[PDB]
Amino acid sequence: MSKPVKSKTTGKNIGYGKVILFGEHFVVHGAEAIVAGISEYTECRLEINPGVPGLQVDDQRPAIPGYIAQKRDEQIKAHQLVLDHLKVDLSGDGLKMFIGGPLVPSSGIGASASDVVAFSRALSELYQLNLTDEEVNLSAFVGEGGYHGTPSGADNTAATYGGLILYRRQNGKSVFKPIAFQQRLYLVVVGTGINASTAKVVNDVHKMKQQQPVQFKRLYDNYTHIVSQAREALQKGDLQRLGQLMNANHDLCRQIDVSCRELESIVQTCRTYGALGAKLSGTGRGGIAVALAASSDQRDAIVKGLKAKCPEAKFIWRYTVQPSAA
């Protein structure tokens, strides 16, 4: 059982946000996915709470209205899973937790993973556990079990490592590797305000494949071609090509029936206002859409356009993926 070495964290213990750039839904069936850990993050600060047992959560994340209250019971389970995993006993002296960072918690942004990653790093500091990224990622994965469900590993992996990540089901579980990229990704991420059930939509897609094996196989193959090109576009640093491929990916997502009217409105407006590419991101049928801008100034025009002309764009965020290398 781990005992606290520090009385208060002084580090910057964070978990990155996440957007799926390519391959939501198709990844379930063996295709390669591109997941982006964004710069924007959740921070966890910890300090000892002498004589006061348990974990006191001071959650001040800039979450969308109602989100924190909705997710609190899951968060309780999640934090306790991390605490148990790391063998931390708070039955005597507990902990005060402060949760901050600029990441806006909302469905589709991997905010729950960001939370448990930040918490795992903060615990590692306070208890001087010297956790590797691998160990942080596992702690987060375990904790993610407290939210529903089930975690693929993509959210926690993006939250602990950051940057661009190749995600595939291989031999025969989730396999992750970093993607090297030399350019900044200027993203507009848009929340619909609608929460969809990952499990239901995935199972609906499973049923579509069952009902139309030949048609689904074609869409699946069409996807593998897009992500193959997406990888090359990334290696080249051709953002215009990447954007075009994002659009093509969205088209395939509509064909497996994971879009909706609100998402269509957002992507249409994004493209109208000069986005290189725009698509739903993640589960679909609600959640977030993601648009790629060529620059920061061109991102301004898209945000302007969405605010003015797209009422379905309930929440609008400027997110960035920092380059991995010089």
Ligand X SMILES: C[C@@](O)(CCO)CC(=O)[O-]
Active site residue 155: yes
Q: How far is CA 118 from the centre of its chain?
A: 14
Binding ligand X (rule: CB under 6 A), the pick from 14, 27, 36, 78 is: 27
Task: Tell which one of 4, 6, 12, 28 touches ligand X (CB under 6 A).
Answer: 28
* Least Å from the CB of residue 23 to ligand X: 7
Among 120, 192, 198, 244, binds ligand X (CB under 6 A): 198
Name the one range near ligand X by CB under 6 A: 23-31, 66-74, 218-226, 297-305: 23-31
Residue nearest to ligand X (CB): 152
Looking at residues 232 to 291 of the shown chain, list those that interact with ligand X (rule: CB under 6 A).
282-283
Per-residue binding letters, 41-80, with ligand X (x by CB under 6 A): ----------------------------------------
Helix H, strand E, coil C: the string for the chain is: CECCCCCECCCCCEEEEEEEEECCCHHHHCCCEEEEEEEEEEEEEEEEECCCCCEEEEECCCCCCCHHHHHHHHHHHHHHHHHHHCCECCCCCEEEEEEECCCCCCCCCCHHHHHHHHHHHHHHHHCCCCCCHHHHHHHHHHHHCCCCCCCCCHHHHHHHHCEEEEEEEECCEEEEEEECCCCCEEEEEEECCCCCCHHHHHHHHHHHHHHCHHHHHHHHHHHHHHHHHHHHHHHHCCHHHHHHHHHHHHHHHHHCCCCCHHHHHHHHHHHHCCCCEEEEECCCCCCEEEEEECCHHHHHHHHHHHHHHCCCCCEEEEEEECCCCC
CA distance linking residue 65 with residue 193, whole number of Å: 10
Which range in 25-33, 217-225, 259-267, 301-309 contacts ligand X by CB under 6 A? 25-33
Stretch that binds ligand X, among 19-27, 127-135, 234-242, 259-267 (CB under 6 A): 19-27
Size of interface with ligand X, in residues (CB under 6 A): 10
| Residue 152 found at the interface with ligand X (CB under 6 A) | yes
The number of residues in the chain equals 326
Interacting residue with ligand X among 202, 294, 301, 316 (CB under 6 A) = 202
Taking the least distance from each CB to ligand X, the nearer of 21 and 123 is 21
Cα R_g (the chain), whole angstroms: 20
Nearer to ligand X, 28 or 301 (CB): 28
Q: Which of 155, 221, 257, 297 is catalytic?
A: 155
Q: Does 25 bind ligand X (CB under 6 A)?
A: yes
Nearer to ligand X, 40 or 43 (CB): 40
Q: Is 156 in the site for ligand X (CB under 6 A)?
A: no
- Return the residues of window 297-316 that contact ligand X according to CB under 6 A: none
Query: Which residue, 25 or 85, is less far from ligand X as judged by CB?
Result: 25
**At closest approach, how far in Å is the CB of 110 from ligand X?**
8
Residues near ligand X (CB under 6 A) are 24-25, 27-28, 152, 154, 198, 202, 282-283
Point out the residues that are catalytic: 155
